[PDB]
Ligand binder design. Sequence first.
Ligand code: A7G
Lengths: 137, 140, 140, 126, 130
Amino acid sequence: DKPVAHVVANHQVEEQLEWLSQRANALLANGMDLKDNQLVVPADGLYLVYSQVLFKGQGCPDYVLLTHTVSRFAISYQEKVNLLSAVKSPCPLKPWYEPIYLGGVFQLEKGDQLSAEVNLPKYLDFAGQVYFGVIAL
Amino acid sequence: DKPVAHVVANHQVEEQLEWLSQRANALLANGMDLKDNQLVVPADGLYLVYSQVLFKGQGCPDYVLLTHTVSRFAISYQEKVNLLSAVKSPCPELKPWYEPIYLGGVFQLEKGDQLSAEVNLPKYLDFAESGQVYFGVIAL
Amino acid sequence: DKPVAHVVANHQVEEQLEWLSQRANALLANGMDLKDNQLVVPADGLYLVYSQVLFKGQGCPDYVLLTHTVSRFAIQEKVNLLSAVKSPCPKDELKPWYEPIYLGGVFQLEKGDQLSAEVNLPKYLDFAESGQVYFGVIAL
Amino acid sequence: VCPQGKYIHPQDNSICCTKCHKGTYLYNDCPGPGQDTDCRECESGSFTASENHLRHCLSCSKCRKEMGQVEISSCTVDRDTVCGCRKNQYRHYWSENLFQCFNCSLCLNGTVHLSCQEKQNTVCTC
Amino acid sequence: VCPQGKYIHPQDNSICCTKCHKGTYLYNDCPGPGQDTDCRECESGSFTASENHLRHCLSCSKCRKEMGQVEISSCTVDRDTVCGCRKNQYRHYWSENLFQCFNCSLCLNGTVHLSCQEKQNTVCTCHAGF
Ligand SMILES: Cc1nc2ccc(-c3ccc(N4CCNCC4)nc3)cc2n1Cc1ccccc1OC(F)F
């Protein structure tokens, strides 16, 4: 009955975090739509909003910071605003893996567009459990 | 229909992790209430309980330990009990470091139980931007 | 309505990571069951599967490798769902270290599938306090 | 569809309503077509920086001391806090919304080719 | 509202009931107003350290060997394990609920000003030096 979305990273397009709706364990239902890499809410309501990303690296040659952010572009406030955000400094040539997982509940309105992105897609890990999802409560 | 809460850190009060409900994209609904910095359940049930915090630091002058804990103060018990807890040692040019901590889990709770989410060293929190520190509850 | 589980480490059994349900603030509901240290799914579906562990150590006497793994035994072979490795030690003052590891993901599962969450070296786990080691499942 | 500056009243699709100005947040919708929306000024530490029908103001950002940032402009109801770098410094951006302040490169045994800009170091020939 | 020491019976809002004592957990509610709650003593490795109507005891904590802690008092049904430091040591608290044991400072090239306390090192002064 209730709008849901679970979209996953496109592995074939490294250098950009591109969300896919038809894929490994991926879904888009009951009005949830995916336009311009943004999930779009089909009705005012409460929503669980979540995203995970997995960052891979062999050594820390030059110093890296990773950011991961889920953000809302509301009809009510027509500017991009952070809902969930995190920063990590994975720098420990030893290999490293760093996940980042965000989740929260949010009141949203029909037409609001949610986006989930990172600063450095090249560091993402093709491996699927990179996902971005929305569930209407 | 179902009780939900998403509260966020107060940026204006460094040195204490103070939760706020009255902000855009912070929410308190359907009986969820916020009293004495604690979320309060309005009915017995199953709940998703979560919190995130982001710890900032500029170089590693002094060695630090950071803790983040979500805890329950039940009617049934009435002392603070850990639900979710984590510890991090981010420390061995002053290069800056960031360490997020996210805790989440499902819990049976009763009307009136009070959940709290706190850290040991608020001074190390990162209130730069919104979305980085929050504490929330969702009734299943 | 939907199956959920949140089970926690047994502190009384050091040297093995044993999950407990029959405990305050540990939960098992709507068909989720716990048999032979494994969570057991009551119906085909999508599930959020997550686990957290906290590894402790005082200085770095011996170089250690820690693994944390959640795995699926589908109804007839075990499959890795979530895995992580950490070398918290230098291989070189004895300062204490803490290494949390969180794994989480969404998975398609079938009635009867058995999920397990384990580590290589339970002795390094941190059963000091509650809330630090858990394994949980939520039906989407 | 409502006209410019207006939004559709959530409870009644006929009533169609005046948005709120930067500096204020929607406390309550217009009673009806003629009347004004009950909009109210942001409390200290919050702000709204565009026309809105938001139900609370957004939180002001604070500047990143860990990155050696400094306050250019303080927060206010109609504008979020503005951060930057000291003079003789330049912003290095790690993300869209995360930069670090670094001392400009003085060109030792060399000629400053391009001067030190705000978001870029000295292109510097040595 | 129930009186002191009592809780409202979950199935019947009229019946109104005796909480359980430290050392025990609620196995079953009072049958009725006069009668006692079926509370039972905590299993080994668990405890309840206050009046409650909990349905399971809490797990005992273990002491932090990574912090060089030592068991003062074992766990028991009415009290969680109590941790501390060896003599000639002091607790350095990192958080309300997290301390580390450190050997007390003997005052090298100096005089012990304040003695070594339990939760604080020797305030310790140097001789004509630094
Ligand atoms: C990182 C991440 N990945 C996720 C993947 C799925 C969901 C999720 C999926 C479904 C759901 N339901 C089922 C349908 N009804 C409401 C609750 N609730 C949460 C949450 C997820 N999260 C965030 C999360 C992790 C662990 C516990 C709670 C979490 O969410 C928090 F915001 F409640």
